Design a binder for this molecule. Sequence first.
Ligand SMILES: Nc1ncnc2c1ncn2[C@@H]1O[C@H](COP(=O)(O)OP(=O)(O)OP(=O)(O)O)[C@@H](O)[C@H]1O
Ligand SMILES: Nc1ncnc2c1ncn2[C@@H]1O[C@H](COP(=O)(O)OP(=O)(O)OP(=O)(O)O)[C@@H](O)[C@H]1O
Ligand SMILES: Nc1ncnc2c1ncn2[C@@H]1O[C@H](COP(=O)(O)OP(=O)(O)OP(=O)(O)O)[C@@H](O)[C@H]1O
Ligand SMILES: Nc1ncnc2c1ncn2[C@@H]1O[C@H](COP(=O)(O)OP(=O)(O)OP(=O)(O)O)[C@@H](O)[C@H]1O
Lengths: 166, 536, 411
Amino acid sequence: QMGCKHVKGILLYGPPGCGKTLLARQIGKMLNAREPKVVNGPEILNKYVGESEANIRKLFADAEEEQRRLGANSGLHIIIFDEIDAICKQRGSMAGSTGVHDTVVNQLLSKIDGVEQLNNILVIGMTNRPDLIDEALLRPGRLEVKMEIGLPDEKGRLQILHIHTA
Amino acid sequence: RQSIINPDWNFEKMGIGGLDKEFSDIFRRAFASRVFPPEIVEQMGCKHVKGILLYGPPGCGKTLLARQIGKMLNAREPKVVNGPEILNKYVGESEANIRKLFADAEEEQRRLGANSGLHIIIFDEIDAICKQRGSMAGSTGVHDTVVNQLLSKIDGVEQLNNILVIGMTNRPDLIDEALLRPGRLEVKMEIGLPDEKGRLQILHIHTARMRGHQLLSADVDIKELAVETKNFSGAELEGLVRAAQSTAMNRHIKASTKVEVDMEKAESLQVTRGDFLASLENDIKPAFGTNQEDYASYIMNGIIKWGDPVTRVLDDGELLVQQTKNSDRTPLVSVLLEGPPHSGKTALAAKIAEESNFPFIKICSPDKMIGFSETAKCQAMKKIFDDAYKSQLSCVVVDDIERLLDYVPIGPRFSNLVLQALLVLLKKAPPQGRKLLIIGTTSRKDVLQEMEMLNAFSTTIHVPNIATGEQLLEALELLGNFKDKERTTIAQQVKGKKVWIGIKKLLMLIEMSLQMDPEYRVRKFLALLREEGASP
Amino acid sequence: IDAICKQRGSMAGSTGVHDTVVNQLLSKIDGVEQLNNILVIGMTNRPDLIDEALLRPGRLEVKMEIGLPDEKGRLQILHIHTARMRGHQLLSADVDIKELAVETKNFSGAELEGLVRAAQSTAMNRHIKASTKVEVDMEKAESLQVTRGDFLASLENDIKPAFGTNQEDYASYIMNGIIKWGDPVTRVLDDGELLVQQTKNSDRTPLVSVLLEGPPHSGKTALAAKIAEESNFPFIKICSPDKMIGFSETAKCQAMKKIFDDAYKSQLSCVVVDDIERLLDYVPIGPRFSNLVLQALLVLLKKAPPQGRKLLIIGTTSRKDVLQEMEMLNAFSTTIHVPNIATGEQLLEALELLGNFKDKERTTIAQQVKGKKVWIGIKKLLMLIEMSLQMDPEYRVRKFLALLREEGASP
Ligand SMILES: Nc1ncnc2c1ncn2[C@@H]1O[C@H](COP(=O)(O)OP(=O)(O)OP(=O)(O)O)[C@@H](O)[C@H]1O
Ligand SMILES: Nc1ncnc2c1ncn2[C@@H]1O[C@H](COP(=O)(O)OP(=O)(O)OP(=O)(O)O)[C@@H](O)[C@H]1O
Ligand SMILES: Nc1ncnc2c1ncn2[C@@H]1O[C@H](COP(=O)(O)OP(=O)(O)OP(=O)(O)O)[C@@H](O)[C@H]1O
Ligand SMILES: Nc1ncnc2c1ncn2[C@@H]1O[C@H](COP(=O)(O)OP(=O)(O)OP(=O)(O)O)[C@@H](O)[C@H]1O
């Protein structure tokens, strides 16, 4: 009765060792949905023409099929991008990785939000260099919830020490 | 005989606001000849348009328009191409993909002739497969063959009259120049930020359903929200509404052990104006608007009136703002604020810009260009100035010019490229109908005069130091640190002398003096003040 | 034809398919076996890239270049693309085709056809009235007629040439028009007319140059633009420093070379080079500048176009002595001086033609100025007037006079 869509992405950034991968792992296994998909850094690149984009497109197929078949009764699908700064970077700045990186960025942008509408996905990204990411991927309707994980204070250190000596 | 438009199509049903003129132009130029009676159009002996291009900044509603156009026509199911979806690794397999899209249109044209329907094709992110021919030395050779095939298929020896192509891009300057001629993609449109009368429409469109079911409180006024949200794109208004709804819905869910919904209270769910205010404070931050963070960072300790000169500077600033906003014989005006070091001339420029009340305000500072070469500095300046030509009223502040040119008295040495760019950028007028104000600050007027740079600026304003004992006493009183017993002792010594000190240094002197013992502070303050010297 | 046929030394990330195709075409067109009943037609946009072995006589002999038409060709195309309308009495009688042919300069056939199509659509759209439901009238639909206003509106809004328009350029270079505040303006325009005539008529000196010099804020760019506009040549272009922000030496040289190469293609052309001291980066300290651009200018100022073609060049600057020290003042044929305002009568006439400080205020100003000499440029006078107008009605003449005094003088 409100006509509102669901948020479609999260981004986490901060210095090393402060608990970004742990939080994503724990969120992945808190939900009733099926197993999540994990991309371990730049593991989609391929030497042949038009193969990286196919690897990108292959991540969303199940979501599209379930959305078409069921509609508003579908489940939830999760994708996790680890070290996302190694793939998505500002378009038209670098040498384009020989025209490869621009195509990958365009494909990802087209798949996340395009003419065909999805409502059953959640994308999580984690990075150490937040300033190198494309500006068109961090807008509302896309990865729009940005969070910073920093050093803890005395209470946080006490909580961690209680956690690790139980 | 069947009408091309759907029987039940209605403009208000599309759900688009703030783009009335764009849709009117598109409809007139694309669909005017497909609705007129066939015999007269045949007598005119004219052909149909077969192309549309949409460009603009992100989030302003390009894909939405294409989708609504696709669903407005009683035709087939439009084909959709998502980015570089056609490439293939086998030789000659990425061109068959291009050829395959027109195979139905060609067949129907051959069979039914002039009584065929309409076939739509949508290219999303077209600049991924249609860059100029020759650039981008991909050594595969698959990036020119595709462009040639597309060009030869859109308009070639064999003629088609039952197609329509829609393209959408963010970088219109990279498309091939042969694809945009009046025979291939004739209609070109720019989708930009809306104004108040468009923001109101967007907010109404996105709040109609909530209003229908009495889920919106009675103390929320849409007009005030439209006035308050300046230079917001279409996406950000929807994001704001979403954040407000989430804040409203989160009050009935307690989650310390196991997600548990109140359920009872959920009956009386209402969205209040406090949620909207909280969402504007924390969640949504625009890109072409103004942010309180910059003003808070550049005016740290506020502005105190320790004398008359402050008021003079502010009044002159106001006069220049008014001239910029209400004149057509001079669309571009610039001023230079100058004075001795530590006199506080950055905060004053920031205050003037803040009080101007223009929609777009930006500050170009060297704090964000550490280690840059002069080429990168020119690129950053050019980008900041280009972003300001897409607004009806703009203000730009250039801070610490001598740090921008990399100046050092020895030699002397500086950067010529940045100087020339800045000299050429102070006289380029904006597109007709737009206004721009520039405020530059510096502390070395003689150097700028020697560089023939005072002919570019229109006027100069002077920011002075504290020059009398009464002014120093008034500043101390307004700051409120030394009490009457100590203020009398200070006045005994300073009243019979002239002083020469800046506010930014007076604050430092006061905090240095405040660290000694309670009965030793006045002596140290006087010693520091005397040692500072005057040397006017 | 350039998609498949290209030089054999090419893409090295190749599987060997783009060379065997060229060899098979060469061997099939003209090989050991002989044919006498074939004809091959090829179309291309990049003739240079094609293989040289395919262009020798006996394989591809007749090479033809299709270019932009002239006024007569434009008239022919406009007549071809309106015959059907004219035959059925669908075209109004106030439409003058010759005026269109004159106005549409640098257009090609496709752009002219698009102009006609847009004009037709603007007329068809006056009957289709639909804000919430499509519905054609069909009552007035039998009285459809395309008028002159439709053509004018479509020319202003929709269709734009791809070879430069100069409408917006002339809009932005001459922003406040030209006002005859004195005698010097007429002299400058007369000298420009004489130079244009000499370029047009004389055949023994195909190349002519001139330099417009004067103190800053005198209005030297507007006068040059006006002279170029009144020249009425087929080709006119302005080379400005404000379209090369951030460029290096090589990029600037390339841009000027491209502009001059385009100029050499036509039959008689005019070119404007404004702000020479900003084109080559001059700064008094040092001094510093770019030698590459200076050498390019000195070389291009004396190069004659191919026989039977004529070129005029107009350069503007505000520092004559600097150009003299580089020995550039000797590369120009002659010079023209653009002076400032020097007398009270000229200032009063300028105020009269500008339309400000009417009646008694003018009398007060005249009383205060006539007993002195003045030294002010035209461009700064507008700034002073707009600055003075922001005061209250009782403090407008006083502020204007104070600013004028503070301006100073230095003949
Ligand atoms: N907030 C925390 N509470 C408890 N343990 C933590 C916390 N943050 C980090 N750790 C510990 O740190 C380990 C590794 O940290 P983690 O991999 O989450 O960091 P990271 O930010 O991904 O590091 P990197 O930037 O190198 O990828 C975890 O397995 C956990 O033991
Ligand atoms: N004029 C508008 N009226 C109503 N909603 C709008 C408008 N413009 C944008 N929106 C909202 O923005 C959402 C996303 O915008 P959209 O995808 O159309 O932008 P875009 O221009 O394609 O952006 P991108 O540059 O990323 O492609 C739409 O679903 C809609 O909710
Ligand atoms: N009346 C006032 N006018 C200006 N600044 C004031 C006033 N009252 C307090 N201040 C504070 O004084 C400080 C002035 O420092 P600011 O950086 O603006 O000076 P500056 O001359 O630009 O410095 P520098 O010459 O070292 O670059 C700021 O913290 C400002 O908030
Ligand atoms: N009689 C006139 N002659 C020339 N320009 C005039 C005249 N009357 C009004 N103008 C206007 O005055 C302006 C002249 O400024 P212009 O930019 O041509 O000067 P400039 O000498 O190039 O200045 P700068 O030294 O800054 O380069 C134009 O807007 C022009 O339309």
